[PDB]
Design a protein around this ligand. Sequence first.
Ligand SMILES: C[C@@](O)(CS(C)(=O)=O)C(=O)N[C@@H]1CC[C@@]2(S(=O)(=O)c3ccc(F)cc3)c3ccc(C(F)(C(F)(F)F)C(F)(F)F)nc3CC[C@@H]12
Length: 253
Amino acid sequence: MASLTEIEHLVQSVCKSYRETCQLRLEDLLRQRSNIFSREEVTGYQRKSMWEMWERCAHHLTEAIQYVVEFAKRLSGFMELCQNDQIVLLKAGAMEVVLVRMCRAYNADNRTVFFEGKYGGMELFRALGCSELISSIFDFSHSLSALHFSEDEIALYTALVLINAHRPGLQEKRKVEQLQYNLELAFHHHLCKTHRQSILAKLPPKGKLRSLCSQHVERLQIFQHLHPIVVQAAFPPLYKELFSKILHRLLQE
Ligand SMILES: C[C@@](O)(CS(C)(=O)=O)C(=O)N[C@@H]1CC[C@@]2(S(=O)(=O)c3ccc(F)cc3)c3ccc(C(F)(C(F)(F)F)C(F)(F)F)nc3CC[C@@H]12
């Protein structure tokens, strides 16, 4: 059950939802590639206190996750699913969706990312005190950039990152399995029709996204043990909910 014309309709529906929930447009990000942070500006970021850079980054991650919630709410089938399943899917997939979406603002020619109005390399995030996590994020982006994704490909791949029937805690597993299968078909059909099936082999292993997320959660536990009042007083509520309700409020609109 689901004919070719229904699969093609799902492709365009997913692409539209992705376009409408993008933080910034792709052309805006490309037109800013020459706006790079100077050595002085880079030094200023490195000289910020660890707690200040953590709070700035947790706020940026929170803002980006808010767009993933909107993308999920526009995805066919997501709002039909029970509240427990919606939250399980968003808690496990939101960081992963943001990590994949970040490749649009990543310039492989100089290994820089769009951050606070300009492009900057890994060295910009030195005050965080997590070089191994920063390296992993930059390597993941570099390896995604080698695939040269079109916007339609990121829309379909990120819908699949989110709609995963294997996430622990799902009460209606089969209902998510059908949704995932329809999106798998829509993604593969789009790759077939556009002569892009060669990327399937070169996509990152599902364990790579899982490793980046566990590194993020473990480094946050290190930060919170040393600065518990900072996390309580200045970290965004949605960020503590997901990584340390708000999600219920966002899902009811
Ligand atoms: C492109 C855009 O910048 C948005 S835009 C288009 O410019 O508006 C974006 O999508 N950003 C994403 C949302 C915020 C950001 S970031 O810019 O602050 C950034 C980027 C690369 C890094 F190596 C570290 C941080 C971020 C913030 C905090 C963390 C941490 F897990 C970290 F990895 F840093 F540890 C943590 F723990 F701090 F939360 N990780 C990330 C990785 C994803 C990006």
